[PDB]
Design an enzyme around this catalytic site. Structure first.
Site, PDB file in Angstrom:
ATOM      1  CE  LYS A 132      44.744  36.921  46.480  1.00 26.41           C
ATOM      2  NZ  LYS A 132      44.057  37.994  45.800  1.00 26.41           N
ATOM      3  CE1 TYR A 186      40.800  31.485  34.451  1.00 24.86           C
ATOM      4  CE2 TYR A 186      40.760  29.863  32.914  1.00 24.86           C
ATOM      5  CZ  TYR A 186      40.266  31.114  33.388  1.00 24.86           C
ATOM      6  OH  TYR A 186      39.770  31.847  32.420  1.00 24.86           O
ATOM      7  CB  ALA A 187      38.102  28.175  38.788  1.00 29.79           C
ATOM      8  CG  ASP A 210      34.923  33.777  54.784  1.00 26.28           C
ATOM      9  OD1 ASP A 210      34.451  33.605  55.838  1.00 26.28           O
ATOM     10  OD2 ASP A 210      35.145  34.611  53.902  1.00 26.28           O
TER      11      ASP A 210
HETATM   12  C1  LIG Z   1      42.491  37.711  45.653  1.00 29.84           C
HETATM   13  C2  LIG Z   1      41.806  38.490  44.692  1.00 29.84           C
HETATM   14  C3  LIG Z   1      40.276  38.378  44.315  1.00 29.84           C
HETATM   15  C4  LIG Z   1      39.958  39.046  43.450  1.00 29.84           C
HETATM   16  C5  LIG Z   1      38.548  38.899  43.072  1.00 29.84           C
HETATM   17  N1  LIG Z   1      38.444  38.538  41.571  1.00 29.84           N
HETATM   18  C6  LIG Z   1      39.294  37.230  41.342  1.00 29.84           C
HETATM   19  C7  LIG Z   1      39.411  36.877  39.964  1.00 29.84           C
HETATM   20  N2  LIG Z   1      38.085  36.603  39.309  1.00 29.84           N
HETATM   21  C8  LIG Z   1      37.856  35.813  38.602  1.00 29.84           C
HETATM   22  N3  LIG Z   1      38.771  34.620  38.539  1.00 29.84           N
HETATM   23  C9  LIG Z   1      38.384  33.604  37.682  1.00 29.84           C
HETATM   24  N4  LIG Z   1      39.376  32.458  37.789  1.00 29.84           N
HETATM   25  C10 LIG Z   1      40.290  32.191  38.765  1.00 29.84           C
HETATM   26  C11 LIG Z   1      40.485  32.588  40.186  1.00 29.84           C
HETATM   27  C12 LIG Z   1      41.367  31.867  40.438  1.00 29.84           C
HETATM   28  C13 LIG Z   1      41.791  32.275  42.016  1.00 29.84           C
HETATM   29  C14 LIG Z   1      42.070  33.851  42.132  1.00 29.84           C
HETATM   30  C15 LIG Z   1      43.279  32.810  42.129  1.00 29.84           C
HETATM   31  N5  LIG Z   1      41.737  30.864  40.017  1.00 29.84           N
HETATM   32  N6  LIG Z   1      40.739  30.924  38.578  1.00 29.84           N
HETATM   33  C16 LIG Z   1      37.280  33.740  36.802  1.00 29.84           C
HETATM   34  C17 LIG Z   1      36.715  34.616  36.766  1.00 29.84           C
HETATM   35  C18 LIG Z   1      35.468  34.932  35.701  1.00 29.84           C
HETATM   36  O1  LIG Z   1      35.070  36.165  35.698  1.00 29.84           O
HETATM   37  N7  LIG Z   1      34.911  33.892  35.116  1.00 29.84           N
HETATM   38  C19 LIG Z   1      33.871  33.717  34.066  1.00 29.84           C
HETATM   39  C20 LIG Z   1      32.745  34.619  34.440  1.00 29.84           C
HETATM   40  C21 LIG Z   1      31.723  35.534  34.900  1.00 29.84           C
HETATM   41  N8  LIG Z   1      36.838  36.059  37.674  1.00 29.84           N
HETATM   42  C22 LIG Z   1      36.936  37.846  39.856  1.00 29.84           C
HETATM   43  C23 LIG Z   1      37.034  38.024  41.108  1.00 29.84           C
HETATM   44  C24 LIG Z   1      40.743  40.037  42.874  1.00 29.84           C
HETATM   45  C25 LIG Z   1      41.935  40.373  43.224  1.00 29.84           C
HETATM   46  C26 LIG Z   1      42.561  39.622  44.231  1.00 29.84           C
HETATM   47  O2  LIG Z   1      43.598  39.765  44.695  1.00 29.84           O
END
Ligand SMILES: *Cc1cc(CN2CCN(c3nc(Nc4cc(C5CC5)[nH]n4)cc(C(=O)NCC#C)n3)CC2)ccc1O
Ligand SMILES: [Cl-]
Ligand SMILES: [Cl-]
Ligand SMILES: [Cl-]
Length: 254
Positions: free
Chosen positions: A36, A86-87, A130
């Protein structure tokens, strides 16, 4: 102690106003995680810098399989950097858009995982998280990961009455959040949604909500128990984890 040199950088998982989340890899272990990257120009344009430093200090000391792990953090001249677990299966918000509603089993499992991570957060002296659908990530096996990390209309939709009415909030807020979530998982919409902020405040403060026909009586019983105006009237987590419809539809143990 950590440095950007130590990471290989991948595609953006999400773009925001406060910054970006990148798929990344620690070069040494080849371990894969999420970076992040935050711009402190925007940690300036808003007043979050102190709340951010706090959140990092608390989340670092937290370790639960249903809490997104903060592995570490570093900074530089222009940016903040957050080594996060990472999720890979996305947010629950996405998933709910995909499926419209969730079944009893998925819902009860999510609620079980939440109640467990929330009792751990309570024991660890963290009274609130939250837990909105967009803050809930999904792990490799579909397991929930509470990710109360990042801030980048339904702002009101999940807030309990003691908040919107400008009062004092204890641990019992997390019970109200659960009831709102449990409702939305099953119905596809939060219980108090409305076309105007004023109407949403009106329904929340007067606990006015109704169930479509298909929501079974155990589900109604739990949600009704959770959505109480008086905070002290809300059950504790252990009564949720041990609740008939939970125990009867959850696949994940307590
Ligand atoms: C804080 C923040 C939040 C967003 C919003 N997006 C975050 C990234 N995202 C997304 N994330 C993952 N995996 C993930 C997120 C994290 C924690 C944020 C560190 N750890 N792993 C996966 C996916 C995804 O699309 N997965 C499969 C499907 C459908 N998306 C989307 C939301 C943006 C920017 C900031 O700074
Ligand atoms: Cl503080
Ligand atoms: Cl408040
Ligand atoms: Cl009215």
């Amino acid at each position: 102690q950590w440095a950007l040199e130590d990471f290989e950088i991948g595609r953006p998982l999400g773009k925001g106003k406060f910054g970006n989340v990148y798929l990344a890899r620690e070069k040494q272990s080849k371990f894969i995680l999420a970076l992040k990257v935050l711009f402190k120009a925007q940690l300036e344009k808003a007043g979050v810098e102190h709340q951010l430093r706090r959140e990092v200090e608390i989340q670092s000391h937290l370790r639960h399989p249903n809490i997104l792990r903060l592995y570490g953090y570093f900074h530089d001249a222009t940016r903040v950097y957050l080594i996060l677990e990472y999720a890979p299966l996305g947010t629950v918000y996405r998933e709910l858009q995909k499926l419209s509603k969730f079944d009893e089993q998925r819902t009860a499992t999510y609620i079980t995982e939440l109640a467990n991570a929330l009792s751990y957060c309570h024991s660890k002296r963290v009274i609130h998280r939250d837990i909105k659908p967009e803050n809930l990530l999904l792990g490799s096996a579909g397991e929930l990961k509470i990710a109360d990390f990042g801030w980048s209309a339904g702002t009101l939709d999940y807030l309990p009455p003691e908040m919107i009415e400008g009062r004092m909030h204890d641990e019992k807020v997390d019970l109200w959040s659960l009831g709102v979530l449990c409702y939305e998982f099953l119905v596809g919409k939060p219980p108090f949604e409305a076309n105007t902020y004023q109407e949403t405040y009106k329904r929340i403060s007067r606990v006015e909500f109704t169930f479509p026909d298909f929501v079974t009586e155990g589900a109604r019983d739990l949600i009704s128990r959770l959505l109480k105006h008086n905070p002290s009237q809300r059950p504790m987590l252990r009564e949720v984890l041990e609740h008939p419809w939970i125990t009867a539809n959850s696949s994940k143990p307590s």
